[PDB]
Amino acid sequence: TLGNTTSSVILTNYMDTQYYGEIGIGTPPQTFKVVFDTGSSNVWVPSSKCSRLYTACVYHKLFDASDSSSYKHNGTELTLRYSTGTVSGFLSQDIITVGGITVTQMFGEVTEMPALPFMLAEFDGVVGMGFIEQAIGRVTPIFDNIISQGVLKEDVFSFYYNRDSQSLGGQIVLGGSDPQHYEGNFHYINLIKTGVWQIQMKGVSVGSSTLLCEDGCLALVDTGASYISGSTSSIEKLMEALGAKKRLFDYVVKCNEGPTLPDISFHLGGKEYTLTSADYVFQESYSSKKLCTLAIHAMDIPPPTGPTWALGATFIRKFYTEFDRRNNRIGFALAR
Numbered sequence: 001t002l003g004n005t006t007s008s009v010i011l012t013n014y015m016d017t018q019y020y021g022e023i024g025i026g027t028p029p030q031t032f033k034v035v036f037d038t039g040s041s042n043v044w045v046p047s048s049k050c051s052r053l054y055t056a057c058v059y060h061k062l063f064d065a066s067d068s069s070s071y072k073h074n075g076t077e078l079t080l081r082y083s084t085g086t087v088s089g090f091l092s093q094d095i096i097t098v099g100g101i102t103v104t105q106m107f108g109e110v111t112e113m114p115a116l117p118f119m120l121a122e123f124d125g126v127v128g129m130g131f132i133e134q135a136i137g138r139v140t141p142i143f144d145n146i147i148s149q150g151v152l153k154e155d156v157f158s159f160y161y162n163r164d165s166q167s168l169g170g171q172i173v174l175g176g177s178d179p180q181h182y183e184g185n186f187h188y189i190n191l192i193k194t195g196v197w198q199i200q201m202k203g204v205s206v207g208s209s210t211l212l213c214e215d216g217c218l219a220l221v222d223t224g225a226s227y228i229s230g231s232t233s234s235i236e237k238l239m240e241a242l243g244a245k246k247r248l249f250d251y252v253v254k255c256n257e258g259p260t261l262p263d264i265s266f267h268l269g270g271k272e273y274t275l276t277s278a279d280y281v282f283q284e285s286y287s288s289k290k291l292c293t294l295a296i297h298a299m300d301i302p303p304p305t306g307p308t309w310a311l312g313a314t315f316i317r318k319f320y321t322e323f324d325r326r327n328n329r330i331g332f333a334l335a336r
């Protein structure tokens with residue numbers, strides 16, 4: 001069922017690495033800073049039942065079911081494994097408010113939240129924008145519950161991630177796209193299969209020559225990821241081609257050599273999606289005596305999804321993204 005409504009959620013941009021908006025859970029609503037993540041399908045927030053020996057829970061907003069009159073008990077255990085860490089807790093149901101839309105949703109109340117990486121998180125939880133196929137415990141994703149209401153103009157949602165400034169951090173539009181944040185026309189790539197926001201990639205070039213993904217590869221379009229990521233192997237080759245040094249969790253260049261780095265192009269569908277060094281280098285200075293982090297890192301995503309590349313905030317900043325559930329495709333347009 002299609003309606004005549006679009007809703008939008010204003011996002012906060014924290015240092016070009018984290019983008020999140022707010023949702024309200026319960027009656028009266030308890031507000032949470034959440035990441036709208038196309039790379040996951042579950043809704044979760046920290047729980048009041050999280051042991052205060054997990055320091056992450058002392059530093060985040062906790063959902064208290066005892067303060068919500070609309071809460072429905074469930075209790076089923078839930079473990080969510082990310083390539084960055086793990087969270088576990090139990091399932092609960094309540095009313096969730098997302099940019100005007102009110103929806104009865106099943107979500108995870110996280111009771112185990114490791115300091116790495118959640119003490120570094122500015123957000124409290126996640127709103128999974130993925131498909132039911134990848135939903136842990138086969139829980140209906142929030143977008144599927146919003147479609148069911150038959151209120152949205154289109155069975156799509158789109159992302160705008162701005163470059164850091166005190167301006168608009170970003171924007172998610174549910175039910176459409178916002179022409180104020182893109183120019184030109186959308187170029188669509190069909191999903192390899194329904195169930196994952198993953199498209200075929202046919203080459204990654206450093207400069208003029210296609211040095212990587214020559215015989216094709218996968219590209220997960222991940223709104224919950226900060227960077228463009230590849231497998232340890234691909235990133236090693238890419239970084240050698242750029243002249244970057246490996247550290248513990250990132251790659252660096254001498255700050256003075258950042259602007260001189262070659263363009264990186266991603267071959268997706270029809271078009272070549274080019275990022276210049278200004279789009280992937282955290283150019284904090286131009287000093288020959290300082291190191292500058294790159295917005296590309298290695299991430300070994302496990303099968304069946306991985307091995308795959310992931311196009312995170314680094315990519316979405318340059319390219320406004322529309323996620324089309326009706327046609328199982330992803331559209332890209334140059335962001336304004």
Ligand SMILES: COCCCOc1cc(C(=O)N(C[C@@H]2CNC[C@H]2NS(=O)(=O)c2ccc(C)cc2)C(C)C)ccc1OC
Binds near residue numbers: 019081122223224
């Ligand atoms: C862009 O701003 C978003 C905020 C970035 O900051 C952070 C993000 C995180 C983070 O890793 N995630 C989860 C990842 C984002 N998509 C899903 C998952 N990627 S994954 O490769 O494991 C994966 C992909 C696909 C499948 C099927 C399975 C596994 C968030 C959303 C919990 C952690 C700490 C952060 O900061 C301290």
Ligand SMILES: *[C@@H]1O[C@H](CO)[C@@H](O)[C@H](O)[C@H]1NC(C)=O
Binds near residue numbers: 075
């Ligand atoms: C929890 O919710 C699921 C639906 O996601 C349901 O099938 C299950 O029976 C519920 N469990 C309890 C104990 O209420």
